[PDB]
Design an enzyme around this catalytic site. Structure first.
Site, PDB file in Angstrom:
ATOM      1  N   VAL A   1       2.669   1.995  -3.231  1.00 31.05           N
ATOM      2  CA  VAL A   1       1.637   1.194  -2.621  1.00 31.05           C
ATOM      3  C   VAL A   1       2.302   0.209  -1.653  1.00 31.05           C
ATOM      4  O   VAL A   1       1.872   0.067  -0.511  1.00 31.05           O
ATOM      5  CB  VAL A   1       0.785   0.456  -3.673  1.00 31.05           C
TER       6      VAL A   1
ATOM      7  N   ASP B   1      -0.905 -20.969  -4.316  1.00 30.79           N
ATOM      8  CA  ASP B   1      -0.435 -20.003  -3.350  1.00 30.79           C
ATOM      9  C   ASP B   1      -1.564 -19.044  -2.970  1.00 30.79           C
ATOM     10  O   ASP B   1      -1.301 -17.924  -2.622  1.00 30.79           O
ATOM     11  CB  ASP B   1       0.783 -19.253  -3.894  1.00 30.79           C
TER      12      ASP B   1
HETATM   13  C1  LIG Z   1      -0.832  -9.616  -4.286  1.00 27.77           C
HETATM   14  N1  LIG Z   1      -0.173  -8.409  -3.826  1.00 27.77           N
HETATM   15  C2  LIG Z   1       0.495  -7.611  -4.658  1.00 27.77           C
HETATM   16  O1  LIG Z   1       0.802  -7.955  -5.794  1.00 27.77           O
HETATM   17  C3  LIG Z   1       0.873  -6.258  -4.141  1.00 27.77           C
HETATM   18  C4  LIG Z   1       1.730  -6.224  -3.045  1.00 27.77           C
HETATM   19  C5  LIG Z   1       2.211  -5.017  -2.568  1.00 27.77           C
HETATM   20  C6  LIG Z   1       1.817  -3.832  -3.151  1.00 27.77           C
HETATM   21  C7  LIG Z   1       0.948  -3.839  -4.228  1.00 27.77           C
HETATM   22  C8  LIG Z   1       0.506  -5.049  -4.728  1.00 27.77           C
HETATM   23  O2  LIG Z   1      -0.160  -5.100  -5.922  1.00 27.77           O
HETATM   24  C9  LIG Z   1      -1.363  -4.479  -6.076  1.00 27.77           C
HETATM   25  N2  LIG Z   1      -1.927  -3.841  -5.073  1.00 27.77           N
HETATM   26  C10 LIG Z   1      -3.121  -3.291  -5.337  1.00 27.77           C
HETATM   27  N3  LIG Z   1      -3.746  -2.648  -4.321  1.00 27.77           N
HETATM   28  C11 LIG Z   1      -3.338  -2.471  -2.990  1.00 27.77           C
HETATM   29  C12 LIG Z   1      -3.737  -1.326  -2.311  1.00 27.77           C
HETATM   30  C13 LIG Z   1      -3.354  -1.137  -0.997  1.00 27.77           C
HETATM   31  O3  LIG Z   1      -3.691  -0.047  -0.244  1.00 27.77           O
HETATM   32  C14 LIG Z   1      -4.759   0.777  -0.721  1.00 27.77           C
HETATM   33  C15 LIG Z   1      -2.553  -2.078  -0.360  1.00 27.77           C
HETATM   34  O4  LIG Z   1      -2.152  -1.864   0.942  1.00 27.77           O
HETATM   35  C16 LIG Z   1      -0.846  -1.310   1.100  1.00 27.77           C
HETATM   36  C17 LIG Z   1      -2.136  -3.216  -1.055  1.00 27.77           C
HETATM   37  O5  LIG Z   1      -1.201  -3.994  -0.428  1.00 27.77           O
HETATM   38  C18 LIG Z   1      -1.622  -5.259   0.087  1.00 27.77           C
HETATM   39  C19 LIG Z   1      -2.552  -3.425  -2.349  1.00 27.77           C
HETATM   40  N4  LIG Z   1      -3.773  -3.317  -6.506  1.00 27.77           N
HETATM   41  C20 LIG Z   1      -3.161  -3.967  -7.493  1.00 27.77           C
HETATM   42  C21 LIG Z   1      -1.940  -4.580  -7.328  1.00 27.77           C
HETATM   43 BR1  LIG Z   1      -1.197  -5.552  -8.772  1.00 27.77          BR
END
Ligand SMILES: CNC(=O)c1ccccc1Oc1nc(Nc2cc(OC)c(OC)c(OC)c2)ncc1Br
Ligand SMILES: CNC(=O)c1ccccc1Oc1nc(Nc2cc(OC)c(OC)c(OC)c2)ncc1Br
Lengths: 259, 264
Positions: B19, B135
């Site tokens: 992801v 944050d």
């Molecule tokens: C607050 N951001 C995170 O903890 C996070 C960062 C990077 C990758 C995953 C992350 O955690 C999470 N990310 C998702 N869904 C998600 C799905 C995405 O694309 C479909 C995406 O775009 C790349 C995304 O990145 C912003 C998040 N769900 C739960 C967690 Br727990």
């Protein structure tokens, strides 16, 4: 019947004392039985109803490895409890030592402070602030001058973080408590010398509003006091962190390096 | 970890289904091993990297466990290997609000109310448990779809910077005594900047650096954000009360939770 905690063991008879969430016993290694340890038992459910960050205390204790900082040897997790196996300090806390002796010679204070300073050098180099240094949190270990000092209780400790969305108070408050420990060390030395803390109050909220309104003056330094110790106390006991002696001045302070 | 598959307790994932990453975690789309229709996010966190940081994962885990709300990203499980720690969390299939704004530009007041209603519901939980996030930002606000804009559900994430409000300490430094509760309203400012960006398309206050924005705020006892003239009275009132430099003067939680804008 001894209770087993990894490679260590203890008897429930050999109680040292309590925390709010922890019970502490005198124990030993199971093979190297001359090796005494303190074993803290901490109920996991009680802890999960508190705001205590044991993970943080453990992370900080692991990061520190110094003769003047209480050692953590092991962490054992059972389903009910967490056990910390730590260095046993056979002298109790500085609070009880001061209760017993009253006041201390400048010679004695120099010895204690040299060790405290050595601990602080490590804290400072890792960017860790203790924030809760006090006589109850300074432990004593005797060999057979013979006293060795050990800083304990990193429950209130924090790391120095050395952004349009972030609250201005948070942006602006970075490093605000960077010199906190220097104040504390000041109050502790003061008590050692004089026999009471420089600033007492009737409650936590009474001391808050005292400091908040700068109803706080340089305390009484006895006229007996050597020039170097007095300079040190004056520079540590500055209400404003802006005006307070910084670490490098403290570590290399004249009082710490003489006859 | 040569193979493409990894097992994590009752869950599994393929390394193909990446992801993204943060600073310390790599995050995969995974599933329950029996209930394979149950999608999860699995964060892998290298233990050696983490031990060189000032990150308190123990704290994040403790706070996530304590929270259990439809607008706060769920934690299902924690698995510890000798190399890594794994967090099994709710998968949000919409990404972050930052990317949503990138895609849409600005949002109608109608849309903002829907998002803010949910954010506020999350804040109510944080506030009642005495937790400050510190944050909140679009990158930390995640999106989950059913099958639509009312179809979107909001989830607050990243409790990395979060802390608990500690509700004669003769030995304690005055700055520490006096600084209790100083950041109690920080999240209200943040939510303000986020709403502002949703509406206008940029944050209210930008600068040349972090230390430049510090001295701007430091030497400007009250600053006023540019509110577009189209802006409804309620939204404008809300932004002005959230975006107060001094927490002394900033709208408090009870005014915010019950604000006219949120029920209209
Ligand atoms: C607050 N951001 C995170 O903890 C996070 C960062 C990077 C990758 C995953 C992350 O955690 C999470 N990310 C998702 N869904 C998600 C799905 C995405 O694309 C479909 C995406 O775009 C790349 C995304 O990145 C912003 C998040 N769900 C739960 C967690 Br727990
Ligand atoms: C902040 N101090 C503690 O962690 C502590 C507090 C209460 C009980 C044990 C504690 O931990 C520890 N305590 C010792 N030695 C010790 C020994 C005492 O009697 C000889 C004593 O007097 C009752 C004492 O008072 C607290 C401490 N050593 C290591 C730890 Br790790």
């Amino acid at each position: 019947s001894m209770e087993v905690v990894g490679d260590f063991e203890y008897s429930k008879r050999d109680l040292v004392g309590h925390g709010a969430f922890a019970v502490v016993f005198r124990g030993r290694h199971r093979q190297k039985t001359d090796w005494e340890v303190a074993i803290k038992s901490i109920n996991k459910k009680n802890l999960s109803k508190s705001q205590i960050l044991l993970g943080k205390e453990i992370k900080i204790l692991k990061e520190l490895q110094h003769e003047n900082i209480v050692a953590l040897y092991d962490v054992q997790e059972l389903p009910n409890s967490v056990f910390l196996v730590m260095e046993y300090c056979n002298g109790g806390d500085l609070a009880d030592y001061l209760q017993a002796k009253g006041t201390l010679s400048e010679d004695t204070i120099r010895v204690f402070l040299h060790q405290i300073a050595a601990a602080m050098r490590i804290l400072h180099s890792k960017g860790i602030i203790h924030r809760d240094l006090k006589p109850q949190n300074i432990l004593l270990s005797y060999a057979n001058s013979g006293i060795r000092i050990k800083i304990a209780d990193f429950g209130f400790a924090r790391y120095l973080h050395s952004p349009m969305y972030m609250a201005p108070e948070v942006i602006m408050s970075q490093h605000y408590d960077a010199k906190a420990d220097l104040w504390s060390i000041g109050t502790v030395i003061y008590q050692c010398l004089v026999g009471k803390p420089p600033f007492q109050a009737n409650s936590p909220q009474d001391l808050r509003m005292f400091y908040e309104k700068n109803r706080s003056l340089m305390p009484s330094i006895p006229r007996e006091t050597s020039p170097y110790l007095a300079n040190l106390l004056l520079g540590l006991l500055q209400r404003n962190q802006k005006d307070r002696m910084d670490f490098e001045a403290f570590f290399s302070h004249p009082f710490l390096e003489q006859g």
